[PDB]
Structure formats: C-alpha cells, structure tokens
Write a protein that binds this ligand. Sequence first.
Ligand SMILES: O=P(O)(O)O[C@H]1[C@H](O)[C@@H](OP(=O)(O)O)[C@@H](OP(=O)(O)O)[C@@H](OP(=O)(O)O)[C@H]1O
Length: 151
Amino acid sequence: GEFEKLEALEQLQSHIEGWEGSNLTDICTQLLLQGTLLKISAGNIQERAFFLFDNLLVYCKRKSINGSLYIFRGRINTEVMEVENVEDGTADYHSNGYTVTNGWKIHNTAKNKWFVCMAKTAEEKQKWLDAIIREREQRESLKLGMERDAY
Ligand SMILES: O=P(O)(O)O[C@H]1[C@H](O)[C@@H](OP(=O)(O)O)[C@@H](OP(=O)(O)O)[C@@H](OP(=O)(O)O)[C@H]1O
C-alpha cells in the first residue's frame, strides 16, 4: 500500500548522493518511470539517469557498503515543466548541431531553461512521452477533483 511505497521512495532517494531540496517522501508517492537519456543543455551533451515521480522530475549522473548509485544534478516541479516533441532529423542549436532522433525538449519554466532529451530507441521515447502525459493527467485529475469538491 501507500506506506510501503513511501519506504521504497526513501530507500530510492538513499541511492542518490548530493540530493538537494525537499525529500521524495514529502512530495511524491510513486515512480512512473526511470531510465537513461542523453541530455543536451547549454551546449553540453551528457548522459543522465532520469526519474519521473508524481509531481517531480529528477535527473542524475550515474556514479562511476556504499549505497550511492547516482549523483544528483537537477530537479523540476512538474507543475512548471513543459514538453515539446522534436522530429527525427532536426539539427539546431538545441542539440549543439547534432542530429536528434528519438528526442524531445523539456522546459523548466521556473528557471526559463530548456534542454533536449534523447532516448536510444523510438519505443523508449514513446514510453517517456506517455509517462509524462500520465503524470500530468493524474496530477490534474487529483487537483480538479479537489477543486470541484471545494467549489
Ligand atoms: O558539466 P558542466 O561543464 O558544468 O556543464 C553544465 C551541465 O551541462 C549541467 O547539466 P547537469 O546539471 O545535468 O550536470 C548544467 O545545468 P542543467 O542541469 O540546468 O542542464 C549547466 O547548464 P546551466 O547551469 O543551466 O547553464 C552546464 O553548464
């Protein structure tokens, strides 16, 4: 049930070193998807481990008894995250001029920051976009349900 999932969140966070900000068990309840993606940001191309929870996207560097597997790099409140598809073959400054396949863009609107994600396969891209949609839908459903109760 919910409580077992919270203990799992605390354990998951314990594998991320250099965590910044509020803890997962205070703001999240579930993991929709985790996976490795290529991230291109501010001219830099870097592979990152991404984790999409309800309300939060986290990305980490993979670490090269010690429980650390990931090094915290960033987090985005999904309420201030936008996503844009990128068509295969696009090559522009967002990808440093490299050709994008299986990619998309993420907008951190709280930082006015954009970056590109690329997956290795089309099916993996589709899993990510589907998970992003599902996280947003679940969050909106819960919010609108509460607002409709209050209104
Ligand atoms: O490794 P260096 O040389 O420091 O380059 C960094 C990394 O690409 C960062 O990505 P990551 O955090 O995944 O390691 C980071 O921010 P983002 O997390 O915002 O992409 C920086 O962009 P900006 O600090 O935003 O300009 C960029 O300058």
